[PDB]
Every structure is written in C-alpha cells, then in structure tokens.
Amino acid sequence: GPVPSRARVYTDVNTHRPREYWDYESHVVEWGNQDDYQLVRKLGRGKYSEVFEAINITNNEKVVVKILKKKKIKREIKILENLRGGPNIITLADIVKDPVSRTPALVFEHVNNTDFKQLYQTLTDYDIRFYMYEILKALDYAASMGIMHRDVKPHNVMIDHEHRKLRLIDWGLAEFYHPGQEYNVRVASRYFKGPELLVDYQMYDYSLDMWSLGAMLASMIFRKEPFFHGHDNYDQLVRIAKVLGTEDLYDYIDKYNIELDPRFNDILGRHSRKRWERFVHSENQHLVSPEALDFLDKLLRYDHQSRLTAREAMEHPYFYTVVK
C-alpha cells in the first residue's frame, strides 16, 4: 500500500496537548447574545454558510456574521478559539444562535478588504513580497499550533490595503494535524489543490498550505489567473505536469508507492520540467526577480516533504527587501 508520511515540523504538537485542545467534538460552545448584532447586508453565500456584514450595536462596531448552514461547526469554532490572537489570524469575536436558522452564527472582526481580482491587478513587486510575508506569519502560527488551513486561496485572504493589514479567514476546512492520520483529499479549491490531493494521497500535512501559497504566488508574479488552469481535478494534475514535468511526478508517486488513477494513462502524456523563465514576459517582468523564481520553485514541488515550510519560507532572500 501507500508508504506513510509525517510532517517534518510541528509533528507531535497535538500529542502533547490535553485532549481538550484537539478533541473538538467534546467542545462546549459558549454562546453570546444574538440581539447584540444587527445584520446590515448579505455579502455572500458559500457551500456551508451565509455571510453578512453586521453591526455590533453594543459598541457600534462593524462585524462579519457567518450563519452556518455537523462536526464542522465545533471544529471551526475550536480551531478559531485555539488560534485567536495569533499573527494575522481572523478574530472570532462571538458565537450566537441565529433565531431564524437555529444554527450557530460566528461573529468575526471586520476587515475593510479590497477584491483580489482588482487588488492583484495593482500590487507592486514590493507589495507582493510584503503581503506574502504576512500570510506566512499566519500559516507558520497555524502549523505551530497543530493546524492546517487546507483552503488557502485569494478569496480567503482579506486585505485592508489602506492600512496594509491582512487576515487569513475561513477556517471551516481547517484540521488538526495528527501524525499518521489519513485526511479527506476533497479539500481546497481546484486551482490551489496540492498534488497530494490530486493523486489521492491522504496522509498529508501543513505542507499542503505551502503548495496553495505557491500557486497563489505564481498567479501574482506571472499575472496569470489561475496559474494552473484545469477544467477538472484530473486535467488539473495534467496542467501541473506540463510545468513541473512528468518524470518528477512519477518520482513523487513512486516514493510514496502511490498509483495514479488509470484514467491518467490517456491524458497525462510526457512532459519535461520547464524553466520558470518561460512564464516571464514584458507585462509581468517587473514582478519577477531571481529571488522570486527561486522562492516559487521551492514551494511548487510535487513532494510535500520537500517544500519549504512556512518558517523556512520566511527565511528566503525574496523577503530581504521587506522592512521588518
């Protein structure tokens, strides 16, 4: 069968915790007062919730309310509480019972965000580095706390560009990392799914989030949205192989004794690894540097164990120009 894998960092953090930290099923929710909150505008509806801008009439402060559409409820709540106060982690302000849905409504701090499709059109080289560094602070904090986000994508990064403030949001797919545990591969959005998900390898870890961050970075520095543009989850892997090459894909699956779905026989082909300079052109060149390409190259690796960790990523020369 498949060869097991473990994270190379923060491997055993949950094993040393009291059960209460990670045993979210046993969590007892602490409920606030739903009348403290007035819904103002519906902002969106996702697979699992409706999201509203609201006002906390006790301090007149703007908040965001997510009214949850079974075990995910306490998992998200517990993860949010565990991570609260960490660098660039969205703050859960309250939890109330919505009287109409009769489900939990998570109340979050408000961030004045700018839409990424319009915002990534305007980031300078310096701002890409600056905001990537801020995302890494959140991801390293999460991993150090035994948590993988599993849905890193531009829609889950809220940026107040006026105040140069960033928050990583939507922890509803997040999980606790337990060495040797097999996880659902049906996580993350198509264009951000790591190869481990696409080849059905369940024993993944924090490094999944570093692949997603690399896919985001590639789209930003190359001005290509998305960078790996698959029509479905199978074609998604083929689009990756057309850049990273098939020999390294086979080496990856061979290392973990993984067998590709046989439907790849007729669609995968044989592809050389490309040099990243291939994607550079007159319109994106100002965002590219040798440091950016090297950094990208060390995130976008098939083998999840070989990617930079968030903490190693923060050490990379790409961030030397960023004021700290």
Angle at 48 between CA 43 and CA 50, to 5 degrees: 25
Residue 49 is assigned to a ligand binding site: yes
DSSP letters for 133-197? HHHHHHHHHHHHTTEE-S--SGGGEEEETTTTEEEE--GGG-EE--TT----S--S-GGG--HHH
Q: Which residues contact 173 (CB under 8 A, 6 or more apart)?
A: 149, 150, 151, 187, 188
Instruction: For residue 254, count other CB atoms closer than 10 A to its CB.
Output: 11
* 47 annotated ligand binder: yes
Asked if residue 50 belongs to a known ligand binding site, the reply is yes
- The experimental method, as deposited, was X-ray
Number of neighbouring beta carbons within 10 Å of residue 172: 23
- Could you tell me which CATH class the domain 23-110 is placed in? alpha beta
> Is 32 known to sit in a ligand binding site?
no
What radius of gyration do the chain's Cα atoms show? 20
List 94, 127, 140, 151, catalytic entry:
151
| Token pair in block for residue 244 | 């990273």
Whether residue 83 contacts residue 145, with contact meaning beta carbons closer than 8 Å, is answered with yes
193 assigned to a ligand binding site: no
**41-57 residues labelled b (16+ CB within 10 A) or e (exposed):** eeeeeeeebbbbebbbe
12 is catalytic: no
Q: Which CATH number fits domain 5-22+111-324: 3.40.50.1370, 1.10.510.10, 3.40.50.300, 1.10.1040.10?
A: 1.10.510.10
**What residues does each domain of the chain span?**
5-22+111-324, 23-110
Shortest CA distance to 324 belongs to which of 130, 160, 141, 165? 130
| Cβ atoms of 298 and 290 closer than 8 Å | no
